[PDB]
Amino acid sequence: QVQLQESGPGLVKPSETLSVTCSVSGDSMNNYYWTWIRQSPGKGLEWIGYISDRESATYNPSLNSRVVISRDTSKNQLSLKLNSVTPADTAVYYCATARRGQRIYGVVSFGEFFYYYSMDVWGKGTTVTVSSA
Amino acid sequence: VRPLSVALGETARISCGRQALGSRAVQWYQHRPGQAPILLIYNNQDRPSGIPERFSGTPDINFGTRATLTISGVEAGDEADYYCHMWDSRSGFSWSFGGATRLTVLG
Ligand SMILES: *[C@@H]1O[C@H](CO)[C@@H](O[C@@H]2O[C@H](CO)[C@@H](O[C@@H]3O[C@H](CO[C@H]4O[C@H](CO[C@H]5O[C@H](CO)[C@@H](O)[C@H](O)[C@@H]5O)[C@@H](O)[C@H](O[C@H]5O[C@H](CO)[C@@H](O)[C@H](O)[C@@H]5O)[C@@H]4O)[C@@H](O)[C@H](O[C@H]4O[C@H](CO)[C@@H](O)[C@H](O)[C@@H]4O[C@H]4O[C@H](CO)[C@@H](O)[C@H](O)[C@@H]4O[C@H]4O[C@H](CO)[C@@H](O)[C@H](O)[C@@H]4O)[C@@H]3O)[C@H](O)[C@H]2NC(C)=O)[C@H](O)[C@H]1NC(C)=O
Ligand SMILES: *[C@@H]1O[C@H](CO)[C@@H](O)[C@H](O)[C@H]1NC(C)=O
């Protein structure tokens, strides 16, 4: 069992860096994937990007790689920075862990399989917004 | 948002808009508004640790079947948002969670 706790600044201005830390306890980061999910109030859930043990810096198409998810194994946390934010990016941000399970439908020697991700253990999330002050 | 109105004590077979383009592996998520989201069904038949025998899925044998979520005897506390994270084989990486489906319980 893992326990995911998150904390951020809470209030940002446009053209800044929204850096929110998501720390884990109990288990290490040996075989646990890491990702972040965003959801605007009034909108649905949006997977913005994930990271793996091979430092996979892959992100969502809407995001268009404007965000970086960093995984520091020294002090045991998961940081997500948002450089050059917009005022129309108000959302509540959840961090969760994933599992790279493969669904095999043909043979594995030809590449007839795909990887699906299961976000099993989530976090409660922080509510950040863009205000005037 | 596709609202499904089902009263208390009645079952609900909620589907999603993305059809199966081959071998699928869907991940049903239950997102309470403001709270933490939770997993319901992964790999279309497997229940994780924490979900009782009320949320059941459909297996992927003999392709042509639809991807749905069967809730037998929904309680009053299941007022949340349901997501269909469809992972088919012929459409590549599905970054989007799909349409946020809001289940409305009547009564
Ligand atoms: C020429 O040679 C080549 C190479 O030798 C041959 O190529 C082979 O081709 C076949 C056909 O394409 C491939 O088969 C696929 O296999 C996967 C395997 O996954 C399962 O099998 C592993 C071991 O299987 C052995 O034991 C089981 C009993 O445990 C036994 O039933 C089976 O017959 C076999 O003896 C398990 O270890 C494995 O677990 C692993 O994976 C899990 C995730 O998958 C993971 O969580 C575990 O931790 C573990 O790591 C797993 O159980 C099959 O999955 C696949 O079949 C699925 O897809 C087809 C098409 O969609 C569908 O019709 C099937 O019914 C099946 O779908 C089930 O599984 C889905 C995911 O698992 C699930 O989403 C579905 O809902 C569905 O679930 C139903 O069945 C399960 C039981 O399986 C049940 O629990 C559910 O309740 C529900 O009823 C393919 O068949 C071979 O991989 C491939 N060989 C190689 C080396 O690549 C070729 O055939 C040769 N040609 C000739 C002419 O000879
Ligand atoms: C393929 O076709 C045969 C008969 O035409 C049918 O029995 C079988 O279920 C089909 N399989 C799939 C995967 O469509």
Author numbering:
A (entry chain M): 1 to 82, 82A, 82B, 82C, 83 to 100, 100A, 100B, 100C, ...
B (entry chain P): 8 to 66, 66A, 66B, 66C, 67 to 95, 95A, 95B, 95C, ...
The publication says:
BG24, a VRC01-class broadly neutralizing antibody (bNAb) against HIV-1 Env with relatively few somatic hypermutations (SHMs), represents a promising target for vaccine strategies to elicit CD4-binding site (CD4bs) bNAbs. The VRC01-class of bNAbs targets a particularly challenging epitope to elicit bNAbs against due to the presence of the CD4bs N-glycans that sterically obstruct interactions between Env and Ab CDRs26. The glycan at position N276gp120 is highly conserved and poses the greatest steric barrier to binding VRC01-class bNAb iGLs, as Ab residues in the iGL CDRL1 that interact with this region are typically 11–12 residues and cannot accommodate the N276gp120 glycan. Mature CD4bs Abs develop shortened or flexible CDRL1s to accommodate this glycan.
The 6405 Env was selected for further investigation by creating a soluble 6405 SOSIP.664 trimer. The 6405 gp120 sequence included similar CD4bs PNGSs as BG505, except for the absence of a PNGS at position 363gp120 and an added PNGS at position 465gp120. Consistent with neutralization results, ELISAs showed that BG24CDRL1-iGL and BG24mat each bound the 6405 SOSIP, whereas BG24LC-iGL bound 6405 to a lesser extent. To understand how the germline CDRL1 of BG24 could be accommodated by a non-engineered Env trimer, we characterized interactions between BG24CDRL1-iGL and 6405 SOSIP by solving a 3.4 Å cryo-EM structure of a BG24CDRL1-iGL-6405 complex. Again, side chains were not modeled for CDRL1 residues. As also observed in the BG24LC-iGL-GT1N276 structure, the CDRL1-iGL in the BG24CDRL1-iGL-6405 complex formed a helical conformation, although the CDRL1 confirmations in the two Fabs in these complexes were not identical. By aligning gp120s from GT1N276 and 6405, we found that the well-ordered portions of the N276gp120 glycan occupied similar positions, suggesting that the position of N276gp120 in these Envs is conducive to CDRL1 accommodation for BG24iGLs.
